[PDB]
Amino acid sequence: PNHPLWYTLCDRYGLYVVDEANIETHGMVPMNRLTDDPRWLPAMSERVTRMVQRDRNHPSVIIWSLGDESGHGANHDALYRWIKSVDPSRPVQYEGGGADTTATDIICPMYARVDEDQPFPAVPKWSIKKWLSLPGETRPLILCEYAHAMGNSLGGFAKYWQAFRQYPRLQGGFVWDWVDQSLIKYDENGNPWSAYGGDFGDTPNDRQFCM
Amino acid sequence: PNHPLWYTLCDRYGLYVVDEANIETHGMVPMNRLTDDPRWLPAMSERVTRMVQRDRNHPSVIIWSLGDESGHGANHDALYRWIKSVDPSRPVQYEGGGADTTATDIICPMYARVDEDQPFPAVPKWSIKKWLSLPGETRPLILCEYAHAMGNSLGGFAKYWQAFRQYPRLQGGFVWDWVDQSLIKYDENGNPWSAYGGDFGDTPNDRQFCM
Numbered sequence: 120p121n122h123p124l125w126y127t128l129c130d131r132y133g134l135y136v137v138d139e140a141n142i143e144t145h146g147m148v149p150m151n152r153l154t155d156d157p158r159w160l161p162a163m164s165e166r167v168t169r170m171v172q173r174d175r176n177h178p179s180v181i182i183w184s185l186g187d188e189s190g191h192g193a194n195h196d197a198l199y200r201w202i203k204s205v206d207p208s209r210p211v212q213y214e215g216g217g218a219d220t221t222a223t224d225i226i227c228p229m230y231a232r233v234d235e236d237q238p239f240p241a242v243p244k245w246s247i248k249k250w251l252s253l254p255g256e257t258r259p260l261i262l263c264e265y266a267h268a269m270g271n272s273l274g275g276f277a278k279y280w281q282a283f284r285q286y287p288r289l290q291g292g293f294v295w296d297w298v299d300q301s302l303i304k305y306d307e308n309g310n311p312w313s314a315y316g317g318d319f320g321d322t323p324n325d326r327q328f329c330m
Numbered sequence: 331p332n333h334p335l336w337y338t339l340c341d342r343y344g345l346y347v348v349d350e351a352n353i354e355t356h357g358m359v360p361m362n363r364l365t366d367d368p369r370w371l372p373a374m375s376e377r378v379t380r381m382v383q384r385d386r387n388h389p390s391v392i393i394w395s396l397g398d399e400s401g402h403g404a405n406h407d408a409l410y411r412w413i414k415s416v417d418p419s420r421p422v423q424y425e426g427g428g429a430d431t432t433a434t435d436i437i438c439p440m441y442a443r444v445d446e447d448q449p450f451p452a453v454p455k456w457s458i459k460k461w462l463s464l465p466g467e468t469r470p471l472i473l474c475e476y477a478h479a480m481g482n483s484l485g486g487f488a489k490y491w492q493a494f495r496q497y498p499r500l501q502g503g504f505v506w507d508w509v510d511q512s513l514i515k516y517d518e519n520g521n522p523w524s525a526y527g528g529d530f531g532d533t534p535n536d537r538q539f540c541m
């Protein structure tokens with residue numbers, strides 16, 4: 120959840136918001152180790168429930184999200200239903216565990232390609248065009264993340280937009296991401312320069328991946 | 331319906347057969363002028379019912395078809411339901427009126443392209459990949475006719491097969507068609523040659539379109 124003024128500005132200027140619970144357990148092995156564990160349900164529940172209690176009156180918020188990259192655990196299904204019960208006015212989405220689990224109203228993959236399948240075991244990233252028509256599938260698809268804009272990037276961006284415009288159930292996505300997470304450091308003469316991972320003696324680090 | 335031995339040979343050699351009623355009203359304006367007219371229901375009904383009565387014990391017959399290029403009329407709906415009632419063992423298909431009407435269990439377009447939409451009013455031929463995922467659509471898609479093999483043709487055939495293999499609900503199609511409808515004529519010297527439309531003094535004619 121963002122600084123409260125963010126929603127006020129989105130209400131007034133006009134932007135659709137996905138408001139997202141502060142839950143990410145990316146580094147766990149497997150990713151759902153905590154989210155499938157009932158002992159972590161209390162802690163997870165408060166990150167979801169308290170977000171809804173704070174932000175449910177903002178018109179800019181159109182979609183709730185259970186968090187990010189925490190696999191798919193029974194705790195997600197429980198909190199999905201909690202939101203659906205408390206606030207019927209907004210769809211709930213969540214990408215973890217393969218982007219099309221029972222904890223999501225929207226097929227919301229990250230970095231699924233337009234035409235190319237990436238058939239990873241357990242959590243495949245189908246071509247988005249293919250994903251829509253999988254046997255029994257009926258939901259809209261909106262990429263929670265796509266077109267990773269790291270450095271000299273956004274190659275193939277037009278391929279997404281051609282597809283979004285051709286397929287009714289391909290309803291767009293959220294580019295990753297808005298702003299480089301570089302930090303200011305200063306040389307011996309006080310001149311500022313942009314620093315990334317590792318530049319503060321931080322180790323292990325993931326270098327320029329913050330930008 | 332074919333010569334009765336055909337089905338015997340398909341039973342024994344092993345070919346899947348679509349058995350199709352002898353109903354085609356292509357030249358009507360609009361195409362459904364007779365098939366939507368209850369006056370023509372009796373004539374139509376016999377072409378469907380007597381086919382099913384004849385061929386229903388052949389294992390090679392896996393799908394019933396209500397005919398060809400006769401638009402979509404209420405008579406199709408009645409006869410679709412008749413077959414479903416009398417023979418639940420086989421899906422019923424029919425392409426007329428846009429290939430995805432209430433008279434077909436299978437989206438069965440003719441000459442719909444792989445990636446390119448052709449958005450004709452009333453009867454669009456969507457990209458087959460796009461067609462599968464239209465809001466609310468869940469049926470399998472098998473082209474009743476594709477890859478018109480007229481003369482030096484079948485360019486882009488590989489594109490169909492790539493899509494068939496990638497998409498579960500794209501379950502293939504029927505090439506148009508098997509054998510040139512040329513007829514043997516003889517010249518002044520009694521030498522045989524292959525003839526097409528118009529070569530018998532027949533007019534109006536559609537020339538080489540029979541091949």
Ligand SMILES: CC(C)S[C@@H]1O[C@H](CO)[C@H](O)[C@H](O)[C@H]1O
Binds near residue numbers: 229264328329
């Ligand atoms: C590097 C991948 C295995 S994880 C990948 O890292 C990215 C780096 O910017 C983003 O954080 C994405 O959300 C994440 O899926």
Ligand SMILES: CC(C)S[C@@H]1O[C@H](CO)[C@H](O)[C@H](O)[C@H]1O
Binds near residue numbers: 440475539540
């Ligand atoms: C020419 C189109 C307007 S109709 C087109 O003609 C073809 C000619 O071989 C085939 O008969 C197809 O079945 C038919 O759709």
Ligand code: NA
Binds near residue numbers: 286289290291
């Ligand atoms: Na769209």
Ligand code: NA
Binds near residue numbers: 328329330
């Ligand atoms: Na990053």
Ligand code: NA
Binds near residue numbers: 493496502
């Ligand atoms: Na297929």
Ligand code: NA
Binds near residue numbers: 539540541
């Ligand atoms: Na022909």
